Amino acid sequence: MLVLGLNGNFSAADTDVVPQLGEYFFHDSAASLIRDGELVAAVEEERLNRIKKTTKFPLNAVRECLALAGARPEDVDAVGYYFPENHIDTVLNHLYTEYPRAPLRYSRELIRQRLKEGLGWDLPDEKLVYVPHHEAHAYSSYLHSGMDSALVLVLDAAGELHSGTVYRAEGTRLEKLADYPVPKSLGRLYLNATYLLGYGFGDEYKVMGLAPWGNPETYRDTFAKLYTLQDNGEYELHGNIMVPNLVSPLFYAEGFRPRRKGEPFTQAHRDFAAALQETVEKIVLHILEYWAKTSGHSRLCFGGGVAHNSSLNGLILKSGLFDEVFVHPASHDAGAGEGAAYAAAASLGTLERPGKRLLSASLGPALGGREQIRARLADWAPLIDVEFPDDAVETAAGLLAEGQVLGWAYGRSEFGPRALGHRSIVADARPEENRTRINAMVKKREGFRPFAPVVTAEAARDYFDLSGADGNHEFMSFVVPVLPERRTELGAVTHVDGTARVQVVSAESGERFHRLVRRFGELTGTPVLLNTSFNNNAEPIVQSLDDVVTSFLTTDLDVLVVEDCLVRGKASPDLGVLVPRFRPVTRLVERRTAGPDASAGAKTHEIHLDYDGGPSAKVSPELYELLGAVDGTTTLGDLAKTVGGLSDALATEVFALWEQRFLTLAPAGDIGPLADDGT
Amino acid sequence: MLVLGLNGNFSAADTDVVPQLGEYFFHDSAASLIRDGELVAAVEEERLNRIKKTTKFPLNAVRECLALAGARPEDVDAVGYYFPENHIDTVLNHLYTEYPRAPLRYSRELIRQRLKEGLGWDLPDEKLVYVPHHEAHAYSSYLHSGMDSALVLVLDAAGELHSGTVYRAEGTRLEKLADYPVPKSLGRLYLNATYLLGYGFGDEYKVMGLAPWGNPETYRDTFAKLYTLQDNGEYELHGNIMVPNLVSPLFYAEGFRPRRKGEPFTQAHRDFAAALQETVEKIVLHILEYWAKTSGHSRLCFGGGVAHNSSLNGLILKSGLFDEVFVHPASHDAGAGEGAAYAAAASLGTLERPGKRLLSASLGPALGGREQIRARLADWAPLIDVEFPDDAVETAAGLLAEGQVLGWAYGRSEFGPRALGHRSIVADARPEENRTRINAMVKKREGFRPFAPVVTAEAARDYFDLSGADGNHEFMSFVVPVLPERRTELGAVTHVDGTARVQVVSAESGERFHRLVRRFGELTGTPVLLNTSFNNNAEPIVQSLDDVVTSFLTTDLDVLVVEDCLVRGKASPDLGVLVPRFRPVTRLVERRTAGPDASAGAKTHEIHLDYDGGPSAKVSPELYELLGAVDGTTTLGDLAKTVGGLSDALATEVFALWEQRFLTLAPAGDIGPL
Ligand SMILES: NC(=O)OP(=O)(O)OC[C@H]1O[C@@H](n2cnc3c(N)ncnc32)[C@H](O)[C@@H]1O
Ligand SMILES: NC(=O)OP(=O)(O)OC[C@H]1O[C@@H](n2cnc3c(N)ncnc32)[C@H](O)[C@@H]1O
Ligand SMILES: [Cl-]
Ligand SMILES: [Fe+3]
Numbered sequence A: 001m002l003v004l005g006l007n008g009n010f011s012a013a014d015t016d017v018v019p020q021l022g023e024y025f026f027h028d029s030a031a032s033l034i035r036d037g038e039l040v041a042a043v044e045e046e047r048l049n050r051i052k053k054t055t056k057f058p059l060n061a062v063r064e065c066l067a068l069a070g071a072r073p074e075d076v077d078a079v080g081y082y083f084p085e086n087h088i089d090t091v092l093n094h095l096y097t098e099y100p101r102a103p104l105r106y107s108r109e110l111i112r113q114r115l116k117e118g119l120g121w122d123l124p125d126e127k128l129v130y131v132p133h134h135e136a137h138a139y140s141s142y143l144h145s146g147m148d149s150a151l152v153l154v155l156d157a158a159g160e161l162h163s164g165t166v167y168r169a170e171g172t173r174l175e176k177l178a179d180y181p182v183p184k185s186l187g188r189l190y191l192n193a194t195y196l197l198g199y200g201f202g203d204e205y206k207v208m209g210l211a212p213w214g215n216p217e218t219y220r221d222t223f224a225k226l227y228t229l230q231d232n233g234e235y236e237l238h239g240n241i242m243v244p245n246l247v248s249p250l251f252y253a254e255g256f257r258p259r260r261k262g263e264p265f266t267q268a269h270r271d272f273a274a275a276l277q278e279t280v281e282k283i284v285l286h287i288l289e290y291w292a293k294t295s296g297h298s299r300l301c302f303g304g305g306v307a308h309n310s311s312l313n314g315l316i317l318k319s320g321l322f323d324e325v326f327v328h329p330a331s332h333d334a335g336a337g338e339g340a341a342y343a344a345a346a347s348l349g350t351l352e353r354p355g356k357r358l359l360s361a362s363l364g365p366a367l368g369g370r371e372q373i374r375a376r377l378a379d380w381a382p383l384i385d386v387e388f389p390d391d392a393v394e395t396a397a398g399l400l401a402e403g404q405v406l407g408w409a410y411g412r413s414e415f416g417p418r419a420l421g422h423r424s425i426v427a428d429a430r431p432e433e434n435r436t437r438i439n440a441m442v443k444k445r446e447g448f449r450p451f452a453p454v455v456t457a458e459a460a461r462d463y464f465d466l467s468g469a470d471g472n473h474e475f476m477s478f479v480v481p482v483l484p485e486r487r488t489e490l491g492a493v494t495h496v497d498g499t500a501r502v503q504v505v506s507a508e509s510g511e512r513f514h515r516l517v518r519r520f521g522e523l524t525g526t527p528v529l530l531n532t533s534f535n536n537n538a539e540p541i542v543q544s545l546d547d548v549v550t551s552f553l554t555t556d557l558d559v560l561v562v563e564d565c566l567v568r569g570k571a572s573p574d575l576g577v578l579v580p581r582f583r584p585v586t587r588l589v590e591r592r593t594a595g596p597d598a599s600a601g602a603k604t605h606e607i608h609l610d611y612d613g614g615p616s617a618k619v620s621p622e623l624y625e626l627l628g629a630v631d632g633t634t635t636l637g638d639l640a641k642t643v644g645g646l647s648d649a650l651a652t653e654v655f656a657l658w659e660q661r662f663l664t665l666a667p668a669g670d671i672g673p674l675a676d677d678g679t
Numbered sequence B: 001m002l003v004l005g006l007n008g009n010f011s012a013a014d015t016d017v018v019p020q021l022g023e024y025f026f027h028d029s030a031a032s033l034i035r036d037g038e039l040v041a042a043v044e045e046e047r048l049n050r051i052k053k054t055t056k057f058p059l060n061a062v063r064e065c066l067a068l069a070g071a072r073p074e075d076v077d078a079v080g081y082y083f084p085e086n087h088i089d090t091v092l093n094h095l096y097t098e099y100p101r102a103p104l105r106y107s108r109e110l111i112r113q114r115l116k117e118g119l120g121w122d123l124p125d126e127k128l129v130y131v132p133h134h135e136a137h138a139y140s141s142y143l144h145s146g147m148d149s150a151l152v153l154v155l156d157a158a159g160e161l162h163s164g165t166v167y168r169a170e171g172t173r174l175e176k177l178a179d180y181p182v183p184k185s186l187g188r189l190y191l192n193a194t195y196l197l198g199y200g201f202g203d204e205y206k207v208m209g210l211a212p213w214g215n216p217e218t219y220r221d222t223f224a225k226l227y228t229l230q231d232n233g234e235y236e237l238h239g240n241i242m243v244p245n246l247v248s249p250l251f252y253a254e255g256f257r258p259r260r261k262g263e264p265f266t267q268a269h270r271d272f273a274a275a276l277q278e279t280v281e282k283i284v285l286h287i288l289e290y291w292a293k294t295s296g297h298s299r300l301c302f303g304g305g306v307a308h309n310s311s312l313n314g315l316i317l318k319s320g321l322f323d324e325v326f327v328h329p330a331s332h333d334a335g336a337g338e339g340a341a342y343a344a345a346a347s348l349g350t351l352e353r354p355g356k357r358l359l360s361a362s363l364g365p366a367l368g369g370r371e372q373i374r375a376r377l378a379d380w381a382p383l384i385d386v387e388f389p390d391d392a393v394e395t396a397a398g399l400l401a402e403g404q405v406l407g408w409a410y411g412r413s414e415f416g417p418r419a420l421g422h423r424s425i426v427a428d429a430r431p432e433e434n435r436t437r438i439n440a441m442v443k444k445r446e447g448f449r450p451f452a453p454v455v456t457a458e459a460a461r462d463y464f465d466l467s468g469a470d471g472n473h474e475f476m477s478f479v480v481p482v483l484p485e486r487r488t489e490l491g492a493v494t495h496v497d498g499t500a501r502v503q504v505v506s507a508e509s510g511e512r513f514h515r516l517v518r519r520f521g522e523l524t525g526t527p528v529l530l531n532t533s534f535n536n537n538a539e540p541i542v543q544s545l546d547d548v549v550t551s552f553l554t555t556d557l558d559v560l561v562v563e564d565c566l567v568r569g570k571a572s573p574d575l576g577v578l579v580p581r582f583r584p585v586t587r588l589v590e591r592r593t594a595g596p597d598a599s600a601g602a603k604t605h606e607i608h609l610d611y612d613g614g615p616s617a618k619v620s621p622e623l624y625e626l627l628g629a630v631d632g633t634t635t636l637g638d639l640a641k642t643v644g645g646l647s648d649a650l651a652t653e654v655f656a657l658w659e660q661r662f663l664t665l666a667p668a669g670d671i672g673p674l
């Protein structure tokens, strides 16, 4: 029983179905593959087209999943899509009325066209199954829990009918107990508020990170005017007719000032985050207190995008409402993509389910075999120095004990937003200094952002308070207090309220990463490391060896450990050997605007990425002339010859474009097809 | 007592308050000036910045109104703005949360900044008055009616609180009788439906013109699912939670396929428009049947943007529900700007009002004095031939009788969307082939579109069925039946259903235009002309002399009559003497996207206008190089020398960009102050 689960919109690599298609129109595209009831492969398209939370059709994700499964497209028994057909087609139809030049192609025709043109795959109509959105979420969260029965709660921003749903799950059977309508979305509430802080879609985790720095008393009475808790676990959100934002009109009327780009976070801003987080917590605990008592159940699965609020999950864990709580690594729409595969199989006979609780999210493409990796690392010679230690974990453990910050790339990439030791950046977890050192310098993000610890299963309870229930910690789903007697010891991974988004690694969840942290513990007396995602501020988590090396070379990391090779950056790297390549969304433009006196203004030049929210950057006339000749094969050095050579000024200008990922820059050729490692 | 009325957003000429500010965020910007109760000047900003239904701050309109009144900024006693302060600021606040780079400037600071930087006018806080939106519509529509008591209905997309409001008016006082919430908007319903016919904001009256070609029965039962009439003049619209469009999900579920831009209008499209138009008529007449008998009024003023639905007005006229009906020429938000002035005046003293029913919309800037018009037409000599007939009206009537299609430009431009004899295109109303060609060749628009007649007041009842109530026909507010025995004769202006959006012109409403129509009637026996607005498909109604000549030369008009000068295009027009200028929104781009094997794709060049909805067009490599050197003073002939002479292909390529208004082309100099 081999079933593809699909989520996201339908745009091609280089264009969107409607020009500048909204980034909120079916985001976090992904593909999942199940076989005989198990999740055999899953990867978000963002890892492959390098567009954070992309909406584009997950064609690459499908190709990669089929390769990991050793399947042809025609081997696939069914395809599940994470919304009902009439709902997606109604939304598409609405986009088409707003863009009258777009041809009338609805989801079924588009899915078949993308697979046909992309994979030579001729999908028969009977193999495509469309699925209720909250059902998809519920299957994904509950079926990987290892539980045989559970209360299931789903809370997200937009199901077709509901923003919230409560189920009773038993075996492979879901029974809806309650629902909440779309305008009551707590995910929409959170996003609406997030905009008042100078942030936008995808920044919710930043707002959650900020909230402990604020006082929830300041705006508590203001938020009280936006919701009311009611009997039987009901609530209302109080809308308005003025703007599509629940929160902005009232806060404007009380003098709140939305944060501007590049501005600092005032105490008003910090307190707003704190009150927003406490609001969503109170409503969800209101829901769960009622449905715990009413259903009688002791086990909870929590899905939907809202279940990436690990602070909320920590409060659910400590509430004492449940004995067990499970949360999936990909609880946002990529998880509904997986769930849709299971719902498609259920629609076509009895449902085969996973045999055990999910412990590892290592499910995307691997980096490649040792032969092809070495070969490719050699293409990078003009830029890096490679060692081959005897025990790369031992060497890495010592280097971390020495105080270095490591890139750590091994095996199959993580499904969902957290890095868990397959595409990670790791450092010593004890010195506070590592916080501003990694935030400001190497990862280039805001300072209030705390860092997440990874600890061995054996030492977990010597450092963290996991009480209140038995939650799953392999995926950093839960924020838990750090025990007071360990707070100062864990100076880098302890938030202001003494809490931490802990990963608990085991020989089961990740043998190599468990070995690393254990071995570090023996060397140091503290088996806890800092673990943050391996990417800079302009890209999602790195996927390929090339992505890994590129990201190493464009951040200030000390050493990179990638499949037992120890990589360092040469003294002066020769950028001239790299071959520049446009991304599918790269645009290069010379512009003239209207001058005063109604002349043609003077030429300016820019590069940008053509998707909604895509970045943009000025380029010098000289780099514009160089980039216009990019052919995909000639090296940067050789292209620069046409403008007098790759001078230090040009190389610096190119490097800064590289850091923002406007172009692909890598040695000639590729690493070739990913080899059969025999697993 | 001198009061300025304002409406629109606050964007400058070249930038918008937020980048790509949506075209619906405070559109139809305009300024109005009232002195001693009388509307002395009014013009929409679109006529001056040449962006249809523009949202930009009406800076040029304010300056032009002050000049027409002979007033200085410091003379203005008050300024009214057509929405409450908190409402417009809440919307601005929302846009700022979506665009965190934009600084937190709200409407009071923005309005005073635009006036100070734009006019040198430091406006004190106490002179700025914000006004309820439907109250502003109501004042405008009622105070110009000539009536001393009336029922006043306002229907539009949305005021700050309501989609519709019903008032009692007596003397100068408005008292509210009823209101309808924002989700019940009939304006929003009609605009939602308009999006299904491949159209957008501003196109509603095209859908209106399509409706008589459709059968209203096909989708009647479908539309019946989106509204319910209730007792005592109430009604409800049934929304949905999938998409922000009331209409599209239901019609999708029944297999409706929204027309694509540049595809024909199928019979299902036509039937869709006909059922839509019937639906809104049913609901409005339901509202008005209740409130006429309840309020006791025999007279009705109807305003708000929905009052530009001339078909609806004609059914209100024939309904027998009222003895009299008045509709203002500018019932959309420009008219709300004017009403904001009256409300501002009322809050700062007693309220002076118009002495008479408004008969003329000729309220914008004029074309200029006779000598500056003659001198400026001389500057255009390399492209035009000019005659100076003894009696231009006499000559024009004869040319019309010989089958010529005339541009007609005189005096002050029309306020509101209809051309009424000051910026008009006119032709013989009799041959049906005139509608076919003027649609295809001159206005360059869809063949289904009807044409509106102008008739003399003395012959109106010989041709049209005006009966029922007494409505005002000076501004083409009402669709009326053409008399059956005249439908054959009026081949070009009788719509498929036998109706016509008539302008009845009189010596009092437009003396010169009336003389033209009367004289044409004397020559031919038919005192009726076709009268369409003087603009091509790429511009709003022409304003200045250079606008009129530009439009004449880039439309396929036979002859232009402008302030008694007879203008025709030269056999070979020398485009090289024209000085190209960028418009403030013109952008010139050389672009590369990704190509094969992740290469840089091949260069392309394009020109575009930088506003939401703005057009774009490809340009050749060599025109791109030419336009890159535009300095605003050098002629196109001199500019083309750098690229090796003004080729015949370059001139042709330039002419087509001129026709689409991507740049300004005009002889050196200008007409000077008017
Ligand atoms: N159907 C659909 O909309 O996709 P989805 O399941 O991925 O839900 C995303 C929603 O979860 C909310 N959300 C996401 N992350 C969140 C976080 N860390 N904290 C609070 N809310 C969050 C987010 O604001 C957004 O409203
Ligand atoms: N409300 C506001 O902000 O400005 P406003 O007074 O100018 O109203 C615009 C509204 O009039 C509606 N509208 C315009 N023309 C229309 C027509 N011919 N038929 C129906 N509705 C029309 C249009 O669809 C739109 O919903
Ligand atoms: Cl591994
Ligand atoms: Fe979801």
Ligand SMILES: [Fe+3]
Pocket: B133, B137, B156, B157, B158, B159, B304, B305, B332, B333, B336
């Ligand atoms: Fe209005």
